[PDB]
Amino acid sequence: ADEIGDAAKKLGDASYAFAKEVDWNNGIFLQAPGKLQPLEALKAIDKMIVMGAAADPKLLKAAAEAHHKAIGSVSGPNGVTSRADWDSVNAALGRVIASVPENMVMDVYDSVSKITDPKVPAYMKSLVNGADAEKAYEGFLAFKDVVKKSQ
């Protein structure tokens, strides 16, 4: 047990209503988030490869194992994993994020934001309950504070 684990459980309370509302079987997630810009997208992938090469190998392994288990408990019409496995996933990703320097995480965020059309967040939000999306994001802000303290 650790503090990211505890923080993940508060994140779930804040965000699992939102996770149940997203239709995870929508084909839209395979689409570029706006115009496909292969050269800019390669830049964003390079930043993620750098981050992955720097991330703790055991925490990467655990994150994969948590997603395999989360695939096993998908149910309902939107393909949502169980609440326990949602929390498991979020804690294991928080530990990966904490295992690399802050600059590597911001470089993925900035490099992806460059290729994301400004309409994409509001479009996604419009498909779920907006209050539950707000509550999920406020959850995320509290969670990343604990992550940063282990980082």
Ligand X SMILES: CC(=O)O[C@H]1CC(C)(C)C(=C=C/C(C)=C/C=C/C=C/C=C(C)/C=C2C=C(/C=C/[C@@]34O[C@]3(C)C[C@@H](O)CC4(C)C)C(=O)O/2)[C@](C)(O)C1
Please give the residue ranges that form the binding site for ligand BCL (CB under 6 A): 15, 18, 42, 45, 49, 60, 63-64, 67, 90, 93, 96, 133, 136-137, 140
Options 32-40, 58-66, 81-89, 114-122: segment touching Na ion (CB under 5 A): 58-66
Decide if 126 contacts 19 (C-beta within 8 A): no
Write down the least CB distance from residue 2 to Na ion, Å: 13
- Give the Cα separation of 71 and 73 in Å (integer): 6
- Site for ligand X, residues 52 to 81, rule: CB under 6 A: 52-53, 60-61, 64, 67, 70-71, 74, 79-81
Which letter, b or e, does each residue of 59-80 get, where b requires 16 or more Cβ atoms within 10 Å of its Cβ?
A: beebbeebbebbeeeeeeeeeb
Q: Does 46 bind a second copy (CB under 8 A)?
A: yes
Residue 124 to residue 31: CA distance in whole angstroms: 13
**Segment lying near a second copy (by CB under 8 A), choices 2-10, 22-30, 98-106, 140-148:** 22-30
R_g of the chain computed on alpha carbons: 16
Token pair 């830049």 in the structure block, residue? 43
State the residues that interact with a second copy by CB under 8 A: 24-25, 27, 30-32, 36, 38-39, 42, 45-46, 49-50, 52-53, 57-58, 60-61, 64-65, 67-68, 71, 74, 79
